[PDB]
Amino acid sequence: TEPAIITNASDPAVQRIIDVTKHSKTTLIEDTEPLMECIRAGVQFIEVYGSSGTPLDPALLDLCRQREIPVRLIDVSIVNQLFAKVFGIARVPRPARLADIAERGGDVVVLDGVKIVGNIGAIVRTSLALGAAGIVLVDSDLATIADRRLLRASRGYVFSLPVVLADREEAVSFLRDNDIALMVLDTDGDLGVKDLGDRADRMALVFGSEKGGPSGLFQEASAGTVSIPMLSSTESLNVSVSVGIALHERSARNFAVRRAAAQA
Amino acid sequence: IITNASDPAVQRIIDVTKASIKTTLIEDTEPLMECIRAGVQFIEVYGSSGTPLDPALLDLCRQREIPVRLIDVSIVNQLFAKVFGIARVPRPARLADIAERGGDVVVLDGVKIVGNIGAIVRTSLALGAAGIVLVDSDLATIADRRLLRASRGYVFSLPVVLADREEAVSFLRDNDIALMVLDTDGDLGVKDLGDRADRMALVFGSEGGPSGLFQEASAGTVSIPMLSSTESLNVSVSVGIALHERSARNFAVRRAA
C-alpha cells in the first residue's frame, strides 16, 4: 500500500505511552473542543494525535502550531483498538487549592455531596462560563479532578478555573477566614433567587444533592437560604440546573469581577 | 400486604413486559407516587420481603384501589429495584394537548441523551411549561424505560410528545405560537424573555445547534450571556435558565387554570 511513513502503524512506542496512561502524572484529553479549551487554559501537552485518513480540525492544527505542540497520526486501525478521532497526552496541572479561589475573585460554587460525575462536569462548564471564581467539591467521592470521567463530562473545562477537593470543615473555615458569606440553596428559603444579584459582595453558594440536600455545618454557617420558585413546594430541580439558574442571577456581579481581572 | 414466594402467575407478567406496549414497569418509590398522582393506571405494586414499603406509598395505593404485594427477595433478583409497579401506558399525548393546556412550549431539537431529556422534563414541569416536543430524540415512545427512570417518573406529569421537525413547525404555525431558538450571538437576551406577555415556543438544540427549519421559522434568537461565544452550557442547564426567565409568565398561566 505504501502508507505514508509519518503515520504510526505499529503498536509501540508512543502507543505504549498512550496505553500506559489509559490504564495508569499525565492524562488523555479527547476531542477537538476539549483539547482547545485545555490548551487555552494553559494545560501543558506532550503530543496531540489524530487517526490517519481524516483531516485534523484546522483550528486545532493551527493552535498546536502556535504552541510548540507536536501532532502525529496513528493508523485508524490502532486508534480503533485504543478506546476518539483526536486526542492529546497532557501533564496534569498542579491541583488547585482553596486560596486560588479566593485570589481569583468572584463567587464560590460549593457542591455538598454531589457525586454524579456528569452533574459535576456540567457544573464545571456552567461555573466557568457564568464567571464564578471557582468550585469546591465536598463529599464528591472523586480521587482527583483529573478523573477521566470528569474530564469528559466537563468537556475539558476542569482546568479552566480552580476546582478544589475539600472536606466540609476545611471549606467552611476557609470561607470564614476569607470573609465570604455563604448562602444555601434549598426549598422555601429566605431569599428568592431573583434577589441574589442585589448583594454587591462576592458570596459562596452551596448546593447539596437532593439525595439529601445541604449538610449541617454549612446550614449553621449560612447567612441565609435561597430558593428557586417552582410550581409546587414538593418539586425539585437537578442540581446542575439549580447552579445555572443561581449563577445566571449572579452573572452581573461576576462578569464585572471577570472584566476587571482581564484588565489587571 | 400479602407475599409472593412462588413463580406464577404475576411473576410471569412482570417478565413479559420487561405486546406490552400498553403496559410497563415503573421503578422506585418516588417515581411510582408521581405516576400515580399523574393518573397513571396501575395494575399492581410490589416491594421486597424484608425491607418495608414507604407508608405514604401504601396510603396512596390504599386510597386508589391499587393492590400491593411483597415478592420474595430471591425472585426479585431473578427479575432483575426493591419497589416497582406495573402500569398501563397512558394514551400518548398529542401536540394539541400542549396547546390546550396553555403556557410556553419546550422544543428539543436533536437532543438524544436521555438523562438530559429526563432532567428537562422535570425542569419543564417544575417551572410551569405547557409541555415538551421532542424532535429527533431517537426515542420510540416517551414511555421508554430509560426516560421513565431519567425523568424520575415525571414523563407523564405534563404532555411530552414525539414529533417530526416539519410536523412541529407546522403545529406552532397554525396555533399562532411564536418560536425562538436558543443560540449564541442572537437577536435577544435571555433576560428579556419575560417581556413577552403571550406564550412562546423555545427551541433548544443539542451541542450541535437547532435545525434550519426551526431557524427558518424563528421569530428570534435568544442568547444566554457567557464569558466567551465559544463557551457552551449543557442543554438541560440552558433550559433551566430560559424557563426561569419565563416562570412568572408560565406560573400565571398554570394558576389561572
Sign of the torsion angle spanned by Cα atoms A84, A44, A46, A92:
negative
Widest distance between CA atoms in chain B: 64
Cell of B114: 436521555
Angle at B22 between CA B20 and CA B28, to 5 degrees: 85
The reply to whether B1-91 and B92-257 are identical in fold is no
Q: What is the DSSP string of A76-135?
A: HHHHTT----EEEEEEPPPPP-HHHHHHH-SPEEEEES---HHHHHHHHHHHHHTT-SEE
Torsion of CA B111, B114, B119, B124, to 10 degrees: 50
Widest distance between CA atoms in chain A: 72
* Contact criterion met (CB < 8 Å) for A231 and B190: no
* Contact criterion met (CB < 8 Å) for B123 and A248: no
* Cα A244 from Cα B236, distance rounded (Å): 9
Resolution, Å (one decimal) = 2.0
* Contact criterion met (CB < 8 Å) for A240 and B234: yes
β-strands A86-91, A26-30 pairing: antiparallel
**Residue of A238, A244, A258 lying closest to B227 (CB–CB):** A258
Q: Which CATH superfamily is domain B1-91 in?
A: Ribosomal protein L30/S12 (3.30.1330.30)
CB A56 within 8 A of CB A47: no
Q: A235: how many CB neighbours lie within 10 A of its CB? A: 17
Q: How far is A235 from chain B (nearest CA, A)?
A: 6
B107 contacts: CB under 8 Å, gap ≥ 6: B132, B133, B135, B168, B179, B201, B202, B203, B204, B214
β-strands B41-48, B105-109 pairing: unpaired
CB A78 within 8 A of CB A51: no
**Fold that domain B92-257 belongs to in CATH:** Alpha/beta knot (3.40.1280)
Q: How far is B256 from chain A (nearest CA, A)?
A: 13
Q: At what angle do helices A239-262 and B114-126 cross, to 10 degrees?
A: 90
Q: For residue B116, with 0-12 CB atoms within 10 Å meaning exposed, 13-18 middle and 19 or more buried, which class applies?
A: buried
**Residue of B122, B225, B240 lying closest to A244 (CB–CB):** B240
Element (H, E) at A203: none
* Cα A246 from Cα B181, distance rounded (Å): 22
Q: Is A185 annotated as a binding residue?
A: yes
Q: How far is CA A153 from CA A30, A179, B237, in A?
A: 11, 32, 14
- Is A1-94 in CATH node 3.30.1330.30? yes
**Bridge partners of A191?**
A226
* A142 at interface of B, judged by CB pairs closer than 8 A: no
Backbone angles phi, psi at A193, to 5 degrees: -60, -30
Instruction: Look at residues A95, A107, A129, A60 and name the one whose alpha carbon lies nearest to residue A206.
Output: A107
CB B239 within 8 A of CB A141: no
* Cα B235 from Cα A126, distance rounded (Å): 11
Backbone angles phi, psi at A253, to 5 degrees: -60, -45
* B227 at interface of A, judged by CB pairs closer than 8 A: yes
Q: What is the DSSP string of B32-91?
A: HHHHHHTT-EEEEEEEETTSPP-HHHHHHHHHTT--EEEE-HHHHHHH---SEEEEEPPP
Instruction: Look at residues A211, A135, A148 and name the one whose alpha carbon lies nearest to residue A174.
Output: A135
Method: X-ray
For chain B, what are the domain ranges? 1-91, 92-257
Looking up cell 492544527 gives: A61
Read off the amino acid at residue A20.
V
**Fold that domain A95-264 belongs to in CATH:** Alpha/beta knot (3.40.1280)
Read off the amino acid at residue B129.
A
* Cα B52 from Cα B48, distance rounded (Å): 7
